[PDB]
């Protein structure tokens, strides 16, 4: 009946959204760290190839390794630029909009939770409308519903209750009087009229919306109405705008999954940076035909397919460095070394070696 | 008087906090982007120095440039590690805690704003308790209060209302009945008793807290009480925990200002990476005396002070690249070039040239 407390069908879908929004900062941290980790893996591959080229100076294999190093360095460079320009804004916006909306929801749910007169009459009722619910641990009547922002640790992004189309559980309600409102439980937050609701000497001046515009509480003796949020479209200035903002920001996330962060499997000539470097440094021409590139790639890779690139990378990974450059009993093959700072100083050592050998030879 | 609507002295300090929390995501975007930009500047300097070394093999300054390149590459590497491991969590946590708390505050203030019966009687009153307040642009009764999360552009947040000590304006209240509550304005949100407050058939079974535990609304006919939040200490499980969490997260922020992101001004031998590289690549000993390092630095830098480092950096910045590597009539000095991906391919060109020299020399 109108003006009575809210059964679980009303508030459980709000708990589900609240708990999923709690994971948005975790997914932002996961994605920002994944982006940096992938950039670091590209940089490590660039550094291994660079070190190989210093050790093997003056060989066609070394020239192949310079092409490999340039490829991976360009990927690492472009990934950092994407992290700066695109991912940082995406993830800050998703974190802020989700956390703000979660705060709006949680303040409303926490109000319902506390606004009760007894174990059988209050604003937040169980599935059947028999008992008011209580919060114990992170659950309310068995429903996960912490009403708090959890400590932030990285967690892989997922989407169940808030997805591409909207908030799956926040559908049109055709019979709020019977499905949302109890028959008996008293709750002044269910109307703006003075007899059973928020008004004192008279009704409130207008309808009141709660939970960032989700629920509309009339100033007359009538049931609440709710926004259907399961089929959203971009809008501005809506009464329920924070719901749209969080949905749009989550839908916008690409993660660390754009081309900058992913390795390529489309042959050698089309690999990032390769044709341009061949044109600029080997042919020393501004334009090239495909056959000219293939001829150069045959000289340094013995082919132009993925398999020939992989074969050069295997040579790079198998190349040992001087034992003095790693710890006692530690691996010395480039593919068994990782970490940007570690490989950077190994490259510096071999650049110093190259400078000295150049002096001796000239 | 107890159980009456709230004058501006009560809610204006909450608006001040809500407005300042709105800036925290802007500061997160600012810092995440600043960290990436500073890493990119370090990488550009490493690349310029690397290119100078490739061009000038045969001179002592070329070996100085290897040392310069190693320094900046290590700075770029360590900055990316700091962005991944430390800054990303700091900025996500500050964004989430501030936005969540802002959502809790804004939902409460928006409830007060709407819960009114007339232009002179409601839950949200002006300073004197004469008129109810209305939303007007981005204010409530003229007080900046948007009750929205603003679009996020990078900006450094203010620390006027949330600072190192806590929430400066949320002090102990000595007389809520006279300073927070009006004499006449009706407001069922001001108490849990049934005559004038939230109870229907009787008083609510317990006190109700609102605004993430800031205000306590008693179930008897008495004024509200508030938490003093101006002198916070670290705690867990508090009834007002979201306030503590946002305060702790904001105070923890370093910005992109730790050593990884800042250039050094303490001479050459103490500059990141330099002594170890001299020991490992030039002296080829595991432990060195300070005078042995100075002797090597004299060979390559003509000294060991900042001025000699600056002089080598000037040689690097003045070095022209081949005109075909840049546009027609475009600048050619390394110091007039910027952009990681751009400098990366220039280094590849000069590495290819070096490969061609060694191919003959060997």
């Amino acid at each position: 009946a109108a003006e009575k407390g809210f059964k679980q069908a009303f508030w459980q879908p709000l708990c589900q959204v609240s708990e999923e929004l709690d994971d948005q900062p975790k997914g932002a941290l996961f994605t920002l760290q994944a982006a940096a980790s992938k950039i670091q893996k590209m940089r490590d591959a660039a550094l291994r190839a660079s070190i190989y080229a210093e050790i093997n100076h003056g060989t066609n294999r070394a020239k192949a390794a310079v092409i490999v190093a340039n490829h991976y360095a360009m990927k690492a460079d472009s990934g950092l630029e994407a992290l700066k320009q695109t991912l940082s804004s995406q993830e800050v916006t998703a974190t802020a909009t989700a956390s703000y909306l979660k705060g709006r929801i949680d303040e409303y749910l926490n109000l319902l939770l506390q606004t009760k007169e007894s174990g059988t009459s209050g604003c937040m009722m169980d599935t059947s409308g028999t008992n008011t619910v209580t919060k114990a641990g992170g659950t309310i009547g068995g429903v996960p519903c912490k009403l708090q922002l959890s400590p932030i640790q990285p967690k892989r992004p997922a989407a169940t209750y808030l997805g591409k189309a909207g908030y799956v559980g926040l559908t049109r309600q055709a019979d709020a009087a019977n499905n949302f409102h109890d028959n008996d439980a008293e709750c002044r937050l269910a109307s703006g009229h003075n007899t059973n609701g928020l008004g004192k000497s008279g009704q409130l001046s207008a309808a009141v919306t709660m939970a960032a515009g989700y629920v509309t509480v009339a100033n007359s003796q009538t049931a609440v109405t709710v926004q259907a949020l399961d089929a959203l479209q971009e809008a501005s200035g809506a009464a329920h705008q924070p719901w749209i903002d969080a949905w749009k920001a989550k839908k916008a996330l690409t993660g660390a999954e754009t081309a900058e962060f992913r390795n390529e499997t489309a042959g050698i000539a089309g690999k990032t940076g390769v044709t341009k470097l061949v044109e600029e440094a080997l042919l020393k021409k501004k334009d090239s035909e495909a056959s000219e590139i293939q001829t150069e790639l045959k000289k340094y890779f013995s082919g132009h397919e993925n398999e020939q690139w992989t074969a050069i990378e295997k040579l790079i990974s198998e190349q040992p460095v001087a034992q003095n450059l790693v710890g006692d009993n530690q691996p010395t093959k480039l593919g068994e070394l990782e970490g940007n700072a570690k490989l950077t100083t190994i490259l510096a050592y071999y650049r110093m070696e190259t400078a000295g050998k150049f002096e001796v030879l000239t | 008087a107890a159980e009456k609507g709230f004058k501006q002295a009560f809610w204006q300090p909450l608006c001040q906090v809500s407005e300042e929390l709105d800036d925290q995501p802007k500061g997160a975007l600012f810092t995440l982007q600043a960290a990436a930009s500073k890493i990119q500047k370090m990488r550009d300097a490493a690349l310029r120095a690397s290119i100078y070394a490739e061009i000038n093999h045969g001179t002592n300054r070329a070996k100085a440039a290897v040392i310069v390149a190693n320094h900046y590459a290590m700075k770029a590497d360590s900055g990316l590690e700091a962005l991944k491991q430390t800054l990303s969590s700091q900025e996500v946590t500050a964004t989430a805690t501030a936005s969540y708390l802002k959502g809790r505050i804004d939902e409460y203030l928006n409830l007060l704003l709407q819960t009114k019966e007339s232009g002179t009687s409601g839950c949200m009153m002006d300073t004197s308790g004469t008129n109810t307040v209305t939303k007007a642009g981005g204010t409530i009764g003229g007080v900046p209060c948007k009750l929205q999360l603003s679009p996020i552009q990078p900006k450094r947040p203010a620390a006027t209302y949330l600072g190192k000590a806590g929430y400066v304006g949320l002090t102990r209240q000595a007389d809520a009945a006279n300073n927070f509550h009006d004499n006449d304005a009706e407001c069922r949100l001001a108490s849990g008793h049934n005559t004038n407050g939230l109870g229907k058939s009787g008083q609510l079974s317990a006190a109700v807290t609102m605004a993430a535990g800031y205000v306590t609304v008693a179930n008897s006919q008495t004024a509200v009480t508030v938490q003093a939040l101006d002198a916070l200490q670290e705690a867990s499980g508090a009834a007002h925990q979201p306030w503590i969490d946002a305060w702790k997260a904001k105070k923890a922020l370093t910005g992109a200002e730790t050593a990884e992101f800042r250039n050094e001004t303490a001479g050459i031998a103490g500059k990141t990476g330099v002594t170890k590289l001299v020991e490992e690549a030039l002296l080829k000993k595991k432990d060195s005396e300070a005078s042995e390092i100075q002797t090597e630095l004299k060979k390559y830098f003509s000294g060991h002070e900042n001025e000699q480092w600056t002089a080598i950096e000037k040689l690097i910045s003045e070095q022209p690249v081949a005109q075909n590597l840049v546009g027609d009539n475009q600048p050619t000095k390394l110091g007039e070039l910027e952009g990681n991906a751009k400098l990366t391919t220039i280094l590849a060109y000069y590495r290819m040239e070096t490969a061609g020299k060694f191919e003959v020399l060997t």
Partner: nanobody
Amino acid sequence: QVQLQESGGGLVQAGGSLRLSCTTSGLTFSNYAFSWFRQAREFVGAISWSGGRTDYADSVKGRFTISRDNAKNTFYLQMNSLKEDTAVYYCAADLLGEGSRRSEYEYWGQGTQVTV
């Protein structure tokens, strides 16, 4: 996911002009070279990631022009002397590309119909 969205197509009288736009979402626009293709598939034109090099197919050279607006994440084709030009026009993105019809394109739009 990343989206390239073409717009501006339609029915146009021969001999006139038409501007097509390609707007990206979810992508660092300034990291990518962009090209137009068409299928009545053939290359139309390309711009380098830096914007410093453009290349046009022989069939459109002197009639069509291309430009990029990094601030608006938008890539343009200005069509003039429309004639043989009827086709679906597609935009495509090439990471750090030089503006070449031979490159590997990582992203493609859905196309916009031009009927002359």
